Structures are given as structure tokens and as C-alpha cells.
Design a protein around this ligand. Structure first.
Ligand SMILES: CC(C)(COP(=O)(O)OP(=O)(O)OC[C@H]1O[C@@H](n2cnc3c(N)ncnc32)[C@H](O)[C@@H]1OP(=O)(O)O)[C@@H](O)C(=O)NCCC(=O)NCCS
Ligand SMILES: [Mg+2]
Length: 532
């Protein structure tokens, strides 16, 4: 379709500079925008005027000292240091396409991203420059290497010193609402470049703002890798749309006790994290570290188990409000602060998204019927949807069904419009003309004492083309058991707790299962290998 958006939009000029201006005018006291701590005694805080000044300095470093021009792509690979926030704002101000990536990336990942994006610059931290420098020389478009570090390195520009020398006045580029602001690499096959516009990030953020329950004089802590689109949406835009403060902890180790201590030691009122953050915190006896100031707990990235919600309510007296989204769509469904929580449901449509469950032809289905979760993008493409996969309109096309952008997830919608996540459509198993969800099978296997962990996928079958296969991590108590007899026992066990057509006709015992950094089982990785 197409959009109904203002011609121009820029988050820095249209949002952040408002708050800076308000301070300058005495219309609001100097208010914290960014509070950073390293957990080792170093803290730093910018009010909105200082944030504006310092990010105008960043824009000047980038546009002036490094000569990056409007439309230039800037890889950003930083830990959780304030310079990530300054650099991203710097790019927004200067009209540069920022391309965030994780500080954990290896040189192969870096080479692929730099080459695929034809990035003209990389802004990197100490911890990744050795990896970058192994491959930087094979990226002919890469002209600028900006290092954020307390030290200098030959061949790298010293960002922090350049920042200090830069002018605090930068004329914000009058960016178009639909002009490219960022590229986030997915994994859809090989990683795709999801391009977002100034409006699909910033304007959408402005419209979503406060769904978390955050208010103007509050502090939000989003716990995120700086490379994840979560970081732009919730660490940067949500609080700043509201003129609230974003709290950032270096959090060099994902240390649940550091997290608890932090929540307990700072006046943090809202937090966002992946469900694993909450499950980890629940592995603590939270009771030595009360956090009475915390009011709002939100989560995205994985299904929030009803048990986790229950057990967080138990221990903290707080809700966890779930949200749902992907790189291409940002915040798609959420439980906002005023909405009742339905355990196992991820809420209702964002923000002028029309989210529906749709059938294989693209028709809206009635409540209670499983289909494909989609966002209506015809006749009008809503604000918040990405602009397309860069250099790949076919892959963008392939994900549109009728009037709908397919998220790739199955779902059901209840009577009040709440969505229940029913798994990745690509994880459904097609055996002997039956569709089989892996979750029921995995859940079945999990009831058995021998099974500590399991992942159920398709396996190519001689006789039936595709079969149900289970990878199982054994309880140590069953390591001694006969693999063949145990295999028949588990199948007998599944045949007997679910429709027998669902049972795993193959079982492989493994010592671990591949998982994301947020602890999600990577079934596609297992399925890939499993098909030669
Ligand atoms: C954890 C990791 C796999 C995240 O995956 P990603 O595709 O890069 O990030 P996205 O934000 O697009 O993932 C959103 C997906 O997570 C899932 N998701 C997000 N919020 C969810 C929620 N509340 N409930 C259930 N699933 C949710 C959905 O399946 C969603 O759809 P998608 O797979 O089409 O994208 C990680 O980025 C990674 O690179 N791991 C591999 C190494
Ligand atoms: Mg068990």
C-alpha cells in the first residue's frame, strides 16, 4: 500500500530537541535523559540539554570529522556504553543510516554485514576491534573506523576525543519520514537487511509512547544488547518520547545478582527485558533485594510463560506485561498498562496496526481459529512497518499475503482481540498429511523423567517425506539406559499422552540443544542440519 505520514520526521529534532529546548527555556527543570553506570563505581548522567549538545557533537564528529554524508551507512558495534546512545542520535541528526550489531559478533559475521551493507563506517568498542581488524581490509566501502575506547588504536579514529573537540551545534538534517534511518540484520536463510525509516522508528515510538506505563519523570531500564532493535525502541525512543530518563548498566556479565542489586539500588520505575531476565531473577531469593520503586515490568522476544508471570507476581507483587514484535515490525502487539493481563496472551494491536489472524488466502479469520499473524499493509501501510529488505523486494513481496504482512508466526485471537502465540509457521511438521506443532510433542516428552530438554523438528523421511523427530537431552539417571529401549519407551510415552500420529518416529539423544542468547531453542538450526 502506502502511508499517511508527515513529509518530514526526525526523532532528534522532533522529539529530543523539544526536551532540550524546554530546559533551555526554563519551561522544565534540567531532567535526566541518560543515566549510565558500570557497576564498578563509575556513573554518568546527561540531562536533555546535555544530551542534545553531546549528540550534536556526535553528529559533528560523524558528518564533519569523518565526512559521512546523508544516506551513508554506519555499522555500530558497541557494548552498553553511553556512546551508543550518542552515536545513534548522532546518526539520526546527520541523516546517516545506523546499523547496530552485537559486540559479540565474530569476524565472519562482521565481514558479511559490512560487505552486504557496503557500510562506509563502523563505530566499535575495544572488545570487537580485533575481530573487525581481521576483516576490515576486505570491505572496500569501509572508509571510517571510529573507536569508542579509553585507549587509542592505530588505524582507528578516537571517537571520544573527537567528540570533545566537536561543536555542540549541529543543524539537524530535515529527514523525510520515509527516508532510511536504520538497517537491522535479521535472520530470516542468510541474514536480510531490514531497513527502517525515520518515521517507522521514531514516529511509531512517539505513538506507542507510554504503553509501558512510563511517565515523564520516571526512569526506565531496558536490558538489551545494543545491537537489538529492542534497544532503539525501548532504551532510546520510549523514554525519550516522554522526556523520561533511560537507565543503562554496562552489565558486562548477564549477572542476575547485578541486575537485582541494581533494581534495588536505583530509583528505576520501569524495566524491559526478555523473559529469561525475569526467570533468572526468579532464580534468586529476591527477598534480600527489594525493589519497591519498580512499578512497570514489560517483556518481549519470547512467549512469557504463565508460570513466570505467576511466579513474578508472587515474589514481587508486580505484573509482567508482554509485548510482541519482530525486527521488521517493531512493537506489534502489547499489553499496555491499562489492559488486563491474560496469561499466555501477548496483548492486542499496537498503535494503528491492524493485526489479524489470517488464512492461507489472506482472509481475516474469526476469533478462536489458528492462522497466520499478519499486519494489514494494504491499502494503507501503517507507521511502524519497516521499508523493505534492502536490495530484496522479492523477499519483501514473499512475506505479503493479500493485504497482510505475515510475521511468520501462527496465532489465535480471542474474543477481546488478544493474541495467543502459536509458534513459528516454519516449525510446523507435515507428516503423512498431518500438521503437527512441535510444542505439544516437546511438552509430551518433557513429562517423562528421562527428558531434561527437547526440541521437536521435521526430518526428511524415505517413506513419508517428512517425519516428527525429537532431539532429547537425557536426565543423568537415564544415561545408563539402553538407547534403543529408551527410544521406544519415549515414543510409547508420547503415543500415549497425545494423538499417536504426533509421536517422534525418530529420537536422537544429544548433550545440549542450540539456543539463542535469550535462551530460545533454535529449531531452524536443528532442522537445517537435519536435512543434510
Ligand atoms: C533471539 C534471536 C533468535 C531473536 O530472533 P530475531 O528474528 O533476530 O529477532 P526478532 O525480533 O525479529 O524476533 C521476533 C520473533 O520472536 C518471536 N517473538 C517476539 N515476541 C514474542 C512474544 N511475546 N511471544 C512469542 N514470540 C515472540 C516471534 O516468533 C517473532 O517473529 P519472527 O521470528 O518472524 O521475527 C536472536 O536475534 C538471534 O540472532 N539468535 C540466533 C543466533
Ligand atoms: Mg522431565
Amino acid at each position: 500500500g502506502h502511508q499517511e505520514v508527515p513529509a518530514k520526521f526526525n526523532f532528534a529534532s522532533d522529539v529530543l530537541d523539544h526536551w532540550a529546548d524546554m530546559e533551555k527555556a526554563g519551561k522544565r527543570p534540567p531532567s535526566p535523559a541518560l543515566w549510565w553506570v558500570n557497576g564498578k563505581g563509575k556513573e554518568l548522567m546527561w540531562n536533555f540539554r546535555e544530551l542534545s549538545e553531546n549528540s550534536q557533537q556526535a553528529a559533528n564528529v560523524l558528518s564533519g570529522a569523518c565526512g559521512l554524508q546523508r544516506g551513508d551507512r554506519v555499522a555500530v558495534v558497541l557494548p552498553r556504553v553511553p556512546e551508543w546512545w550518542l552515536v545513534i542520535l548522532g546518526c539520526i541528526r546527520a541523516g546517516l543510516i545506523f546499523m547496530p550489531g552485537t559486540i559479540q559478533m565474530k569476524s565472519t559475521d562482521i565481514l558479511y554485514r559490512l560487505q552486504m551493507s557496503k557500510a562506509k563506517a563502523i563505530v566499535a568498542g575495544d572488545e570487537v576491534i580485533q575481530e573487525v581488524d581481521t576483516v576490515a581490509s576486505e570491505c572496500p566501502s569501509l572508509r571510517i573506523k571510529l573507536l569508542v575506547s579509553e585507549k587509542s588504536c592505530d588505524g582507528w579514529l578516537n571517537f571520544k576525543k573527537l567528540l570533545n573537540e566537536a561543536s555542540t551545534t549541529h543543524h539537524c538534517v530535515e529527514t523525510g519520514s520515509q527516508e532510511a534511518s536504520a538497517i537491522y540484520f535479521t535472520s530470516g536463510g542468510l541474514p536480510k537487511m531490514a531497513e527502517h525509516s525515520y518515521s517507522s522508528l521514531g514516529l511509531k515510538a512517539k505513538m506507542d509512547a507510554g504503553w509501558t506505563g512510563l511517565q515523564a519523570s520516571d526512569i526506565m531500564w531496558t536490558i538489551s544488547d545494543t545491537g537489538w532493535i529492542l534497544n532503539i525502541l525501548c532504551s532510546l525512543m520510549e523514554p525519550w518520547a516522554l522526556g523520561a530518563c533511560t537507565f543503562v548498566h554496562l552489565l558486562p556479565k548477564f549477572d542476575p545478582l547485578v541486575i537485582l542489586k541494581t533494581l534495588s539500588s536505583y530509583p528505576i520505575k520501569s524495566m524491559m527485558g526478555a523473559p529469561i531476565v525475569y526467570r533468572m531473577l526468579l532464580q534468586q531469593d529476591l527477598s534480600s533485594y527489594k525493589f519497591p520503586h519498580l512499578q512497570n515490568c514489560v517483556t518481549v522476544g519470547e512467549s512469557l510463560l504463565p508460570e513466570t508471570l505467576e511466579n513474578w507476581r508472587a515474589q514481587t507483587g508486580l505484573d509482567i506485561r508482554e509485548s510482541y514484535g519482530q525486527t521488521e515490525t517493531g512493537l506489534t502487539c502489547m499489553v499496555s498498562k491499562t489492559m488486563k493481563i491474560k496469561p499466555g496472551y501477548m496483548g492486542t494491536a499496537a498503535s494503528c496496526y491492524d493485526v489479524q489472524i489470517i488464512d492461507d488466502k489472506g482472509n481475516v479469520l474469526p476469533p478462536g481459529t489458528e492462522g497466520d499473524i499478519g499486519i494489514r499493509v494494504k491499502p494503507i501501510r501503517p507507521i511502524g512497518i519497516f521499508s523493505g529488505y534492502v536490495d530484496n523486494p522479492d523477499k519483501t513481496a514473499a512475506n505479503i499475503r493479500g493485504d497482510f504482512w505475515l510475521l511468520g508466526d501462527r496465532g489465535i485471537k480471542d474474543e477481546d482481540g488478544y493474541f495467543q502465540f502459536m509458534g513459528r509457521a516454519d516449525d510446523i511438521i507435515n507428516s503423512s498429511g498431518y500438521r503437527i506443532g512441535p510444542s505439544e510433542v516437546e511438552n509430551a516428552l518433557m513429562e517423562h523423567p528421562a527428558v531434561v530438554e527437547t526440541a521437536v523438528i521435521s526430518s526428511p523421511d524415505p517413506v513419508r517425506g517428512e517425519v516428527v523427530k525429537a532431539f532429547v537431552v537425557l536426565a543423568s539417571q537415564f544415561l545408563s539406559h539402553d538407547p534403543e529401549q529408551l527410544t521406544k519407551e519415549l515414543q510409547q510415552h508420547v503415543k500415549s499422552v497425545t494423538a499417536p500420529y504426533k509421536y517422534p518416529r525418530k529420537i536422537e539423544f544429544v548433550l545440549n540443544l542450540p539456543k539463542t542468547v535469550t535462551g530460545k531453542i533454535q529449531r531452524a538450526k536443528l532442522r537445517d542440519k537435519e536435512w543434510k
